[PDB]
Amino acid sequence: DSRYEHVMKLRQAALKSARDMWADYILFVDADNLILNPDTLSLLIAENKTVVAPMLDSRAAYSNFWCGMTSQGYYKRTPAY
Amino acid sequence: DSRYEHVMKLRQAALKSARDMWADYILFVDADNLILNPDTLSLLIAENKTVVAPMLDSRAAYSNFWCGMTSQGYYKRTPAY
After folding, report:
1. C-beta separation of A22 from B23 below 8 A
2. How far, in Å, are A48, A74, B16, B25 from residue B9 at the CA level?
3. What is the phi/psi pair of residue B42, to 5°?
4. A40 Cβ partners below 8 Å, 6+ apart?
5. How far apart are CA B35 and CA B19, in angstroms?
6. DSSP string computed for B27-77
7. Which residues of B touch A19 (CB under 8 A)?
8. Which of A46, A61, A81, B68 is an S-S bond match for B76, by CB 3.0 to 4.6 Å?
9. What CA–CA distance (Å, rounded) separates A65 from A44?
10. Closest Cα in chain A to B20
11. Which residues precede gaps in chain A, with C-N > 2.5 A?
């Protein structure tokens, strides 16, 4: 739980630091997320939605978007996955 | 001629602190002009031009915009004034 707390605090500090620089957008890459296609940022920016997140592939079913949380926020597959 | 070169050194050192902060627009007001009509900033913003300036008034003909430079950048009263 200390690691969860630290990650939350660090991301919150990043967001706070991106509001005092008067900056549109804040794109949160992480360690291993290989952003291959060079035009990712332009294609996300030119779409005008508040929180958008491209769908990265993988080797198996795993990806980076759910389709439904049941009662306490755990995966529930919905046939539109 | 030793005061001018301390005037520019205080604007060219201001137009540089509004380019490293990502700040649209910059309003140069010298502490001698009465900014009366409280909607001057919105009315200037909504005009969408590169360098725009309100036409303040004064007791005599002198206002803050010329209408022609002759050869050496000194006033010439074009009949459109």
Report:
1. yes
2. 41, 60, 11, 20
3. -65, -40
4. A54
5. 25
6. ----TT----STTHHHHHHTT--SS-------SSS--S--S-B-SSS-B--
7. none
8. B68
9. 16
10. A21
11. none
CA of A20: which chain B residue's CA is closest?
A: B21
Q: How was this structure determined?
A: cryo-EM
Cα–Cα distance for residue pair A59/A65, rounded to 1 Å: 15
Which residue, among A17, A20, A22, would best test binding to B if mutated, counting the most B CBs under 10 Å from its CB? A22
Cβ <8 Å between A21 and B23: no
Contact call for residues B55 and B65 (beta carbons, < 8 A)? yes
* Nearest alpha-carbon partner for A57 in A34, A73, A23, A77: A34
Distance CA A52, CA A29 (A): 13
Separation CA A40–CA A28 (nearest Å)? 13
| Rg of chain B, C-alpha, whole Å | 16
